[PDB]
Each structure stands twice: as structure tokens, then as C-alpha cells.
């Protein structure tokens, strides 16, 4: 908690390459991870990748705890490495502290607001429900800061008494096009130094984009073995028609394949 990241890293390097007793602990990695994820300037996501890699390699003595997943969820969500977050979130899921510690107080940019908001604006909605079930277990409610969005008059005349454009001269209602290296939107509240990406009305994205996994196997030769059939053109033709949207052809389950089996055979085959 000093702002400058490379004042704690110098301490960490004094322990990683140190003697037997002064070797880094699981608490030590939490502090250095925390010191890098809340820097005031410059890109800092690559240095977090190193620390995770070093922690991964030294694993028979070091095991992750609740705060390690909490900080990794926060760090991977501020910059748009959402995938990398969802993964980690899961781990947190099986901790009795829940997202209350991940939320912490409203300070530090309210990381729980980031995870909820950033999941919605990208396309990941099924896991957003999974997140909401996890808060309902022990956590206090969804943060009000996490709930902010842009027949009846959408230009209400009723809200404008309760945000500043009212009898009170402090017109706190949002203006637009203010220039400067600031944010004219809200993108949460102010945080998440990148820009928010637009999920199209909770419509087409990440369902047609997920389908690329199905198309990945058919467009790839080595990952698919299949059988003999018509040499190596049976499954290829399925990819050819699947690229151009959908035109019937519900014949059968021609692919019926697995994804690399996570196997590492030494010699061959």
C-alpha cells in the first residue's frame, strides 16, 4: 500500500532467490500480487502473469488461498482478461468467505461491481446468474454502484428531481462530450481503465461466438481422428456448410469427437 509497485517486488526478489528459511510464502505472493494490481499508471498485467507462473511452478510447497483468488479476480477483471477471471472466480466459489471479501468495502473500485458489470457487457450471462446465486449464499446485496444503466417517457420528467437537474442548482446530471483524458460514460463508476465493450442488448454474441469451438474441431485436421469413412473429407464438408450460417442438414452426429484429452504421451502416437 505505497502506490509504487516496484518497492515490494524488490523485497520479493530478495526472498525468491534467498536462502531456505526466507523463501516466499503463500501470504508473500498475495502482497506482491496486490501491490501490482492497484498501480496508478502503466500496464501491469504481464507482471501478474509472471507471479502466477512462479507460484504455479513452486506448488508442492505453496497452495493458493482465498485472497489469492480474490485478487486475481480483481486484477484480471480490471483489464479485460475476463475469461481468465471467470476461471478463477470458480475457485473462489468454493470458499466460505464468498464474494464479501472480494467485494470488501465500497473502496478499491468495488471489485464485485466490476465482475458483475463486466460479465454483462461482454456476453457472459449464464455465469452472471451463477455469480448471483453465489452472493445470495452469504454476501450482502448487489452493490448499488453495480446497478447503473443509461409508451412512457424515457425522458421521464420524474427522475430529474432526484439527480441534480432540479430545484437544487448543483446539476449533477451527466453532460456529454467534455474532452480531456477522462471518461464521458460511467463504465461502472470510474474504474476499469480500459473501455467497456458493448454487449448487443443481451443478444447475438458469445452464442454464435461459442459455436467457433464446434467449428474449430471441424476446420482442424490433427485434432480430429474420426474413422476411415471417405478419407479426410467427411467432416471437412460439415465445416464448409456450417460457416455459411445454417441451411438444414440435420443428418446425424458426424463429429462425435473429444478435445485433445489433456494427454501428454512421451514417445509417439
Amino acid at each position: 500500500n505505497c502506490g509504487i509497485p516496484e518497492v515490494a517486488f524488490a523485497t520479493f526478489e530478495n526472498m525468491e532467490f534467498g536462502e531456505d528459511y526466507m523463501k516466499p510464502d503463500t501470504e508473500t505472493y498475495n502482497w506482491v500480487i496486490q501491490a501490482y494490481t492497484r498501480a496508478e499508471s502503466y500496464d501491469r498485467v504481464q507482471d501478474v502473469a509472471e507471479l502466477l507462473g512462479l507460484m504455479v511452478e513452486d506448488h508442492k510447497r505453496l497452495q493458493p488461498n482465498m485472497r489469492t483468488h480474490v485478487l486475481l479476480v480483481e486484477c484480471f477483471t480490471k483489464y479485460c482478461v475476463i475469461r481468465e477471471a471467470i476461471r478463477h472466480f470458480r475457485a473462489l466459489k468454493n470458499f466460505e468467505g464468498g464474494t464479501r471479501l472480494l467485494h470488501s468495502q465500497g473502496n478499491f473500485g468495488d471489485p464485485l461491481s466490476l465482475y458483475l458489470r463486466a460479465l454483462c457487457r461482454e456476453g457472459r450471462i449464464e455465469e452472471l446468474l451463477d455469480a448471483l446465486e453465489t452472493m445470495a449464499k452469504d454476501n450482502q446485496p448487489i452493490p448499488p454502484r453495480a446497478m447503473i444503466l443509461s409508451g412512457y417517457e424515457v425522458d421521464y420528467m420524474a427522475r430529474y428531481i432526484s439527480e441534480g437537474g432540479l430545484t437544487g442548482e448543483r446539476k449533477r446530471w451527466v453532460p456529454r462530450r467534455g474532452k480531456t483524458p477522462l471518461d464521458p460514460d460511467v463504465e461502472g463508476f470510474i474504474y476499469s481503465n480500459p473501455v467497456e465493450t458493448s454487449f448487443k442488448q443481451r443478444c447475438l454474441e458469445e452464442w454464435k461466438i461459442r459455436h467457433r469451438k464446434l467449428l474449430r474441431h471441424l476446420r482442424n485436421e490433427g485434432p480430429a481422428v474420426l474413422g476411415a469413412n471417405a478419407s479426410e473429407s467427411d467432416y471437412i464438408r460439415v465445416e464448409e456448410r456450417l460457416k455459411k450460417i445454417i441451411k438444414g442438414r440435420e443428418k446425424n452426429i458426424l463429429k462425435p469427437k473429444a478435445a485433445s484429452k489433456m494427454v501428454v504421451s512421451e514417445l509417439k502416437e
Partner: protein
């Protein structure tokens, strides 16, 4: 003149530039091509252009430096003593270019 260039530097939003260049990179990456040598080498230069564009824009976003400063308006002048005019006897002067 340089006024329009500087104003344009002071106009475009960096985050929108990042989003648009990411979209262009995604569009370029989803094209097979590999049929013509001109087409073989055309995609690579544009992709490198996009990558250095987002690199520069992201560096600009999280720094204390504004783009408008590359089009300067006020010129500093080096101190006099470090560019002196040598006083020689008889009135000879060895000035600085």
C-alpha cells in the same frame, strides 16, 4: 497547416480508437486469403499497423502525456552561456551557429 493536425490530435477518443482497431484486427484475422503474393503481404502490414496503433494508444491512455504536445506551440531556447560568443582581443567574435 499544423493547426488542423493539432486539433485532430485533440479530437479523436483513444478508447474508441482501441475498440475500432480491435474490430479491424478481428475482421482481418478471419480472412483466409493465402492465394496471391500481393494479398499475402498486404494483410501483414495492415495488421502490424493496427497492433502498433493500439500499442501507442494504450500507452497514451495510462500516462501523464497528452498527444497535442507532439504539435508544439512554444519553443524553448537554450541558455546563453552554453552557446556563447567568444570574446577575442581586437574584437574578434567566435559565435555559435
Amino acid at each position: 497547416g499544423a493547426g488542423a493536425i493539432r486539433e485532430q490530435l485533440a479530437d479523436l477518443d483513444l478508447r474508441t480508437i482501441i475498440d475500432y482497431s480491435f474490430a479491424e484486427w478481428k475482421e482481418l484475422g478471419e480472412e483466409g486469403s493465402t492465394g496471391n503474393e500481393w494479398e499475402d503481404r498486404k494483410v501483414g502490414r495492415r495488421k502490424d499497423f493496427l497492433v502498433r496503433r493500439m500499442e501507442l494508444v494504450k500507452h497514451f491512455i495510462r500516462t501523464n502525456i497528452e498527444p497535442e504536445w507532439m504539435v508544439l506551440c512554444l519553443l524553448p531556447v537554450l541558455p546563453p552561456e552554453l552557446r556563447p560568443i567568444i570574446q577575442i582581443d581586437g574584437g574578434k567574435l567566435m559565435s555559435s551557429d
